[PDB]
Ligand SMILES: CNc1nc2cc3nc[nH]c(=O)c3cc2[nH]1
Ligand SMILES: CNc1nc2cc3nc[nH]c(=O)c3cc2[nH]1
Ligand SMILES: [Cl-]
């Protein structure tokens with residue numbers, strides 16, 4: 001049988017790595033992209049379609065689910081995997097990031113966050129919710145420091161997150177079934193400040209986690225600054241564990257993050273922007289609603305192997321999106337998630353073959369032409 | 370190769386018949402239910418999923434499509450079959466029924482109907498639009514008489530429809546490619562009046578059509594009256610051609626209409642009411658939004674063979690519909706269309722075995738228990 005958790009690196013090029021995470025519910029090829037499941041569904045896709053695109057793992061948002069149906073109810077019904085019909089690994093978020101963005105009112109304290117959608121979300125309760133959902137990769141409960149942040153506020157915030165990381169570790173370890181079958185990732189904070197990023201990495205490594213996320217990025221700083229922070233931050237994390245960049249991102253963000261040592265990604269961009277009419281192609285994104293596509297018989301992308309590009313034209317999908325048809329959302333989403341998975345496959349293959357630097361240059365030349 | 374059109378009756382029980390229509394693009398098993406494609410899509414389903422439910426033919430609404438993308442544009446793009454990815458027969462409506470229900474302003478004359486969505490829809494233009502879409506079964510352009518109607522108004526309306534039926538026949542026959550590859554159905558009018566229904570049937574048979582629809586029903590008269598009109602109206606039509614009841618209907622409407630000699634049906638009920646949360650079951654319809662389903666781990670229906678009932682619970686679908694999730698619409702629609710196809714299969718098999726009367730009684734006892 002597969003282990004609870006084993007990350008193996010098969011090939012490297014510069015800071016980039018490719019390999020596998022083996023878990024009880026399946027193998028994850030890295031670098032990996034996780035489609036996002038909000039409210040127990042990857043929007044507009046059956047799980048079998050998600051799998052057909054090549055996804056090995058999905059991210060399950062916890063915020064909506066902890067309110068409706070509720071984590072206890074999902075547990076009573078057999079857990080999130082059974083409920084939604086996805087039998088492979090699920091990484092769950094802690095619920096706190098979306099509490100801060102989606103709740104009407106919030107109150108912060110050392111204990112946790114209280115909010116009205118009143119509820120308290122503490123590290124202990126977050127870990128319990130993720131347990132009740134049956135998460136395979138559990139995220140420590142943290143605070144995403146806003147950008148920009150003063151050094152004083154970034155330090156205070158990071159220090160609280162590190163106290164919360166230790167509470168998350170102890171809560172996870174206290175629950176035998178969770179400790180034996182799931183993995184726990186810690187989240188580095190420190191805003192854009194190298195010394196705080198180092199303190200955070202040191203604190204997380206002392207606690208010890210199965211993987212390490214770079215938090216606090218993709219929150220308004222822009223790509224140049226994100227990459228500058230990654231340049232010094234990723235090397236601070238243990239080399240032999242996965243590195244997860246939360247909430248990233250656009251295709252070029254992913255490529256550059258892999259060049260800086262990131263192994264895992266999630267983002268709503270392919271799903272949400274697909275429903276809004278944006279299709280990803282090797283020649284850059286297109287907006288299928290544009291009148292220029294009304295008689296275009298080509299597929300969304302000329303090379304894409306996905307089922308949408310085998311069967312339907314730009315003209316048809318243009319018509320569907322303009323008309324507000326559900327099938328438009330379905331087809332755009334399947335193609336965009338397939339594009340993201342094909343990007344990850346090209347990244348993995350190029351690292352394995354020692355030609356990732358060339359792939360990154362070729363990718364950018366064509367995508368931004 | 371298959372013929373342009375051949376209807377064969379394999380078995381009969383009372384007025385009920387079962388058999389096949391062979392056309393160039395495929396075989397249609399009768400009695401048949403046609404899922405409705407609005408704006409070139411059966412809402413929330415890929416065509417392969419429509420086919421997986423057992424559908425042999427779909428109804429393509431023409432009203433939206435003649436406005437956007439436009440019939441000429443669809444023809445330029447290769448026709449409706451290629452555009453939407455359904456390669457089997459399509460019956461197209463004439464566009465007039467929805468002009469009357471969906472247009473802002475309408476003006477009626479002997480030439481046709483002018484409307485603002487300004488456009489003129491005549492019998493000749495309707496037949497041309499259906500040609501440009503690449504229809505397999507073309508409907509004559511008629512007027513659905515409102516209910517109730519006085520005898521005078523029902524007669525005047527029916528007489529106009531019969532003049533329009535002859536114009537539709539001549540337009541269809543004038544276009545060699547259409548006459549050679551498609552079929553044309555005429556539509557009986559006459560409201561609830563036996564003498565007018567007879568005059569209409571006589572006029573249609575004198576013109577000659579490949580199939581005959583019963584028009585002017587399912588417009589507010591209720592089941593008892595609909596069945597009373599069918600009792601005398603269907604025997605007036607040629608026995609050796611298909612009989613199509615337009616816009617019907619609920620499962621019990623279909624069963625009773627087959628008992629009265631109807632071979633073909635279409636309705637938005639399974640698709641539209643599915644998206645709204647109504648699921649059909651052998652024990653009657655259920656509203657999946659009801660709180661009683663929040664922890665119900667059973668499938669939508671206990672016997673249904675569809676993919677939705679193999680894989681997902683009532684509780685999950687309840688959650689999806691409550692949450693407004695696209696997957697909720699997808700799953701409800703697939704199940705409901707599969708239910709309708711299973712109903713038609715049970716009807717066909719029971720007629721073939723000489724036990725349809727018993728099936729109808731058993732169906733009603735359980736569905737209305
Ligand atoms: C879309 N950008 C973005 N999504 C994020 C989610 C996060 N969760 C926990 N902690 C984070 O710091 C964090 C940062 C993030 N940036
Ligand atoms: C939903 N009920 C219903 N949909 C109909 C469509 C029709 N089209 C043409 N002509 C008709 O008489 C006619 C009657 C109908 N009743
Ligand atoms: Cl999304």
Ligand SMILES: [Cl-]
Nearest residue numbers: 412637640641
């Ligand atoms: Cl519909």
Ligand SMILES: [Zn+2]
Nearest residue numbers: 304306309335
């Ligand atoms: Zn594609």
Ligand SMILES: [Zn+2]
Nearest residue numbers: 673675678704
């Ligand atoms: Zn079913």
